[PDB]
Write a protein that binds this ligand. Structure first.
Ligand SMILES: [Zn+2]
Lengths: 113, 351, 225
């Protein structure tokens, strides 16, 4: 173990109480996976940049559209109701710019010196 | 179609869009609204009895949360269900005299958002200076950005300092601290980045002062009081990159540094085969012994620990202790020499 | 572009809520709203403003995609695409049927499309991306570690900013960098390579290169024991 409480192999398979380390072969270090939990999901690049983008393909999104949402320059809708600028109510998908979003979910304001 | 590939920085430099025109008047008002907010949250947890940090969480939730109420709150750490409504329905069901503190608290958290956004440009201009020092420009910006959050947390408007040049400090702090922590593969203490940076400072003078690159003794005298030939050396060792396993070698295409590094951990067929036989032949050796005796040596070494005196205390679990176990070792070891001198099995393992 | 609502005594809701049409607003419920908006509650001038605003759920980045991929009913898409077989003839057949080749392959395997999005990035066992001590008290190590580091760093920071309830603009910035960081790890250089700041402008070896070798490949070669 790390701290050094256990050796010999006599204790084969016991996780240590102090140091938290399993007592096995060291070779196990070339085979044991870890992970990292992301604060926000991230796209696997193979399923995006390999063409035809297997996800884009699945959603009816061209590579440039995909890029835009996936890398943060256009919002895509999921549930709406809104209907301004054009006057046209926009629906379940299709994307919008900052000023489009910040006019819809935030309103219309203007300050004057 | 590889058009908008490397936007990142250009992209983020659209917060010109968020109107940075912050008058003293607007700066103060927002700052004031932040403070009065922070105080309200105290008055609140004072009246409700709830934790102040927990309230602030709920106030943040009702302002930011619409698509910001996180769908994965760290896999059941923060609770984003109806527990927020329950809190808000508590606060909202307060009498007028106390309920006003909720509205103050909401304004405050709304004012924080603006006061931060207003000065994002400031961070960029400060971070612009720290580039190349081992950390990506964008990383520096973000690192500095939290410096700016903290600056807002700390700033008191009653002392009429210019928020700009105040926050300035906190931004600088978070950046420098980030560099000391994040820049190096093998993490190092801060007062050690200090010194390393102090050495590569003095190397500059001592080059041009002398003409030649200074000896170690040269650069130690210059360093000051705790300093030593060995110390300069032993330090610079620590100071290095370090080397990439994936570094190609001479022929470039086929070989890499890593290819040449040999495993010295795992035992090679010859090694392995030995120590396995050893185990077998030691057993065959100490088998023909007193069972009590055999364990003595197995507990003096044969399991795990040197046992300078420890075994001699807990005398073979139960038994006569100390200076009478000293005698057993002797006779047990000497009992093996009777056998070994005759049947030479163990002799050959002494390399 | 708002709607003011004066009030005499009581005032339900507080500044920042999403309301209307016709929602309880103030005074025992005497004041209702009219149009969808965002509450402002004027402390001093006794009036609550409702600012013209819907509660749109429009999002950015992988979080947005993951959702669409989760809600995607493949059973129903398969039927729906089979219903475009030579309906606009050579036009939308030729195209929107290569679309079906995917749908079908997913259906036959039983793999949720969602899975293409990562929310837990796996980590290669350390022993084979080691940190060897070489001559001179200097070290040799795989690039992966340095790719992995910077990713961890950005994730952790993202946690803090979210925990801080930072402005969504500086959060986007973070999420952008995180996405990139993940890209850089998995398959580096499909968007302008990252390098070790000093050493040289040598691009860091990603997993993808480490697997197959960047040399187009897997031939060429570099192949033998
Ligand atoms: Zn242990």
């Amino acid at each position: 173990c790390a701290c050094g409480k256990y050796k010999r192999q006599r204790f084969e398979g016991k996780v240590c109480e102090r140091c938290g380390v399993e007592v096995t072969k060291s070779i196990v270090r070339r085979y044991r996976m870890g992970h990292i939990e992301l604060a926000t999901p991230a796209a696997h690049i193979w399923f995006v940049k390999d063409v035809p983008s297997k996800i884009g393909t699945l959603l009816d999104l061209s590579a440039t559209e995909l890029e835009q949402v996936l890398y943060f320059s256009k919002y895509i809708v999921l549930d709406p109701k809104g209907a301004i600028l054009n006057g046209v109510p926009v629906e379940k998908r299709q994307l919008l710019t900052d000023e489009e979003y910040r006019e819809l979910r935030y309103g219309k304001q203007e300050t004057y010196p | 179609p590889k058009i908008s590939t490397s936007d990142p920085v250009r992209q983020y430099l659209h917060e010109i869009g968020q109107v940075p025109l912050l008058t003293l008047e607007e700066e103060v008002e927002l700052a004031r609204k932040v403070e009065e907010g922070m105080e309200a949250i105290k008055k609140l947890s004072e009246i409700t009895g709830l934790d102040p940090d927990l309230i602030r969480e709920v106030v943040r939730a009702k302002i930011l949360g619409s698509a910001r109420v996180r769908h994965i709150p760290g896999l059941k750490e923060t609770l984003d269900p109806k527990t927020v409504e329950e809190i808000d329905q508590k606060l909202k069901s307060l009498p007028k005299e106390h309920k006003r503190y909720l509205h103050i608290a909401r304004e405050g958290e709304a004012a924080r958002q603006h006061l931060i956004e207003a000065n994002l440009r400031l961070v960029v201009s400060i971070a612009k200076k720290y580039t190349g020092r081992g950390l990506s420009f964008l990383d520096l910006i973000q690192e500095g950005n939290q410096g700016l959050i903290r600056a807002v947390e700390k700033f008191e408007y009653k002392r009429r300092f210019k928020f700009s040049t105040y926050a300035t400090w906190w931004i600088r702090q978070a950046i420098n601290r980030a560099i000391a922590d994040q820049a190096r593969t093998i993490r190092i203490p801060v007062h050690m980045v200090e010194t390393i940076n102090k050495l590569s400072r003095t190397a500059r003078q001592l080059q041009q002062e002398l003409g030649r690159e200074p000896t170690y003794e040269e650069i130690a005298e210059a360093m000051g009081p705790g300093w030593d030939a060995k110390r300069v050396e032993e330090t610079l060792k620590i100071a290095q990159e370090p080397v990439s396993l994936e570094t190609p070698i001479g022929d470039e295409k086929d070989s890499f540094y890593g290819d040449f590094i040999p495993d010295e951990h795992l035992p090679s067929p010859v090694d392995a085969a030995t120590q396995s036989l050893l185990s077998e032949e030691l057993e065959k050796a100490l088998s023909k012994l007193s069972e009590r005796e055999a364990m003595v040596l197995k507990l003096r070494k044969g399991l795990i620990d040197g046992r300078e005196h420890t075994l001699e205390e807990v005398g073979a679990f139960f038994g006569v202790t100390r200076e009478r176990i000293r005698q057993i070792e002797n006779k047990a070891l000497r009992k093996l020499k009777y056998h070994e001198s005759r049947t030479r099995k163990l002799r050959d393992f002494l390399d | 572009k708002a709607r003011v609502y004066p009030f005499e005594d009581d005032v339900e809701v507080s500044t920042g809520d999403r309301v209307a049409p016709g929602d309880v607003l103030a005074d025992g419920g005497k004041v209702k709203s009219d149009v969808y908006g965002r509450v402002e509650v004027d402390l001093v001038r006794n009036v609550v403003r409702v600012v013209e605003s819907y509660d749109i759920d429009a999002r950015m980045g992988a979080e947005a995609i993951q959702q669409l991929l989760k809600e995607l009913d493949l059973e129903a898409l398969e039927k729906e695409l089979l219903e475009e077989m030579k309906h606009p003839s050579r036009a939308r057949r030729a195209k929107a049927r290569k679309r079906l080749e995917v749908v079908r392959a997913f259906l036959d395997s039983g793999n949720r499309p969602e899975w293409m999005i990562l929310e837990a990035v796996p980590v290669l066992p350390p022993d084979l991306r080691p940190m060897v001590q070489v001559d001179g008290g200097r070290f040799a190590t795989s690039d992966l570690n340095d790719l992995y580091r910077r990713l961890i760093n950005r994730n952790n920071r993202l946690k803090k900013l979210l925990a801080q309830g930072a402005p969504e603009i500086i959060i986007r910035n973070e999420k952008r960098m995180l996405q990139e960081a993940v890209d850089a790890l998995l398959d580096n250089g499909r968007r302008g390579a990252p390098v070790t700041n000093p050493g040289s402008d040598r691009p860091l070896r990603s997993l993808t290169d480490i697997l197959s070798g960047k040399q187009g490949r897997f031939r060429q070669n570099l192949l033998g024991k």
